[PDB]
Ligand binder design. Structure first.
Ligand SMILES: Nc1ncnc2c1ncn2[C@@H]1O[C@H](CSCC[C@H](N)C(=O)O)[C@@H](O)[C@H]1O
Lengths: 39, 289, 40, 114
């Protein structure tokens, strides 16, 4: 396709594809960074 | 039977012939011997039926075996009333002027010229003689492309959560256009029950119902095969066309265009636009410019 | 080919192939491993 | 109170009768006759046609069964040649169908008209 545009040609709306990140590890990283910031 | 020898059985039949009335043992040849039966008359006979009521092309009556024990294939034939052709199972004689003639095309019963592909009739195993319909029915490959549904030779579809919505149906291999895909099999049910059950599914938004003909409906919620999870699209790579095979209407599925490995299958539901947004309002494709 | 267009304020307001996603067992909604894309 | 039924477009085509384009039967006709030696006029109509024309020249004519064939060859032999030359006038008109004004032309060139 010579007229092919940028990568955004997929859809206007879609269901969520689910996130790979977890909430519990965010708290551990936060507290890990909290003590890291304290030093 | 090895218990008795032919003697005293031949003699028993002598006793049986003296007791039971003799069999008729009558043979017939019919007044017609050959000729006077050109298939253009059949097409003319079909033309007569076509202009009478098949012009509407909306009242699809499923085949019913008509009984003509003594009467000829008159206009009182139930198939004639049902604007349909008699079949090999019809009680109409072997000279019934409604039965499909055959599928004699030399290359294969698959293209526009062939009467099978243009008509509703999937080519009979005993009729599409040139396309190898009866030949090597065990062998998967054959010249014809209008007997896979007869053989049941589907494709190897895949199940995975469709990106558009929920479950869908994927394909492991490339497939070309205008060729057989897996058949949307299901359950035979009448209209009235279909609306009652559909009312339940309409409440639950499910639509595993398919308008087989005006006389029967096929539903895929409780019982079915994989392809019932195919999603709808307004311009899908695959389409749906009712076929008519061996006296049972079914719905064949075929890809509109050339397909490669791993493409998700879609087909048009043919619902109203109001019902389209009511049910299938997701299409997932904008305009490029 | 990268466009490499000239920087400008007005500039502002995926050739996939093969398989992409995992497929599940059609019979039982179970995860189907890639080792049986054929007997399945 | 009708549920939304997933439908498919229905079709009802049948075998279309086949008609040869006009004039293409003719070429098929010509060659099977130019390769055919038999008489082109029914055998008996002459035996009741000539026994009538001759009746006016003299009365009570008992024909001989072979002679009736002898005329029956000439009439065909006279006509066939005339049509062959008739076509030559027709094609000379740039038309392709013969017309009764060409038989009368092609009969004056030969000299039978006088
Ligand atoms: N393209 C589409 N957009 C939104 N809904 C659709 C759709 N195609 C089919 N549907 C809906 O999906 C229902 C079939 S059940 C399949 C739904 C979905 N694929 C899943 O697995 O969860 C139908 O009742 C229809 O209303």
């Amino acid at each position: 396709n010579k007229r092919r545009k940028l990568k955004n040609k997929r859809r206007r709306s879609l269901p969520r594809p689910h996130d790979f990140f977890d909430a519990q590890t965010l708290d551990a990283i936060r507290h890990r960074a909290i003590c890291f910031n304290l030093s | 039977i090895g218990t008795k020898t032919c003697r005293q059985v031949y003699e028993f039949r002598v006793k049986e012939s003296s007791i039971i009335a003799p069999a008729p043992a009558e043979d017939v040849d019919t007044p017609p011997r050959k000729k006077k039966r050109k298939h253009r008359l059949w097409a003319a006979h079909c033309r007569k039926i076509q202009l009478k009521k098949d012009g509407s092309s909306n009242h699809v009556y499923n085949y019913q075996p008509c009984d003509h024990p003594r009467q000829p294939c008159d206009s009182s034939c139930p198939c004639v009333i049902a604007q349909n052709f008699c079949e090999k199972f019809c009680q109409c004689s072997s000279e019934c002027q409604n039965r499909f003639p055959g599928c004699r095309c030399k290359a294969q019963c698959n293209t526009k010229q062939c009467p099978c592909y243009l008509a509703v009739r999937e080519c009979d195993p005993d009729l599409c003689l040139t396309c190898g319909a009866a030949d090597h029915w065990d062998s998967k490959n054959v010249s014809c492309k209008n007997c896979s549904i007869q053989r049941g030779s589907k494709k190897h579809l895949l199940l995975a959560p469709s990106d558009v919505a929920g479950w869908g149906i994927f394909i492991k291999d490339p497939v070309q256009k205008n060729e057989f895909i897996s058949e949307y099999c299901g359950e035979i049910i009448s209209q009235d029950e279909a609306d009652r059950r559909g009312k339940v599914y309409d409440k639950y938004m499910c639509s595993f119902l398919f308008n087989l003909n005006n006389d029967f409906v096929v539903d895929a919620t409780r019982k079915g095969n994989k392809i019932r999870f195919a999603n709808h699209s307004v311009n899908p790579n695959c389409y749906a066309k009712v076929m008519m095979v061996n006296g049972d209407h079914r719905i064949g599925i075929f890809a509109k265009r050339a397909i490669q490995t791993g493409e998700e299958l879609f087909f048009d539901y043919r619902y109203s636009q109001a019902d389209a947004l009511k049910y299938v309002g997701i299409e997932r494709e904008m305009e490029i410019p | 080919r990268p466009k490499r267009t000239k920087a400008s304020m007005s500039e502002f307001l995926t050739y996939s192939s093969g398989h992409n996603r995992l497929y599940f067992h059609s019979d039982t909604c179970l995860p189907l491993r890639p080792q049986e894309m054929e007997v399945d | 109170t009708k549920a939304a039924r997933k439908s498919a477009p229905a079709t009802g085509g049948v075998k279309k009768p086949h008609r040869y384009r006009p004039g293409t039967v003719a070429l098929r006709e010509i060659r099977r006759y130019q390769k055919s030696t038999e008489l082109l006029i029914r055998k008996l109509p002459f035996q009741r046609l000539v026994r009538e024309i001759a009746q006016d020249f003299k009365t009570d004519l008992r024909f001989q069964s072979s002679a009736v064939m002898a005329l029956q060859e000439a009439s065909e032999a006279y006509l066939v040649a005339l049509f062959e030359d008739t076509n030559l006038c027709a094609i000379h008109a740039k038309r392709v169908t013969i017309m009764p004004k060409d038989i009368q032309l092609a009969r004056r060139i030969r000299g039978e008209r006088a």
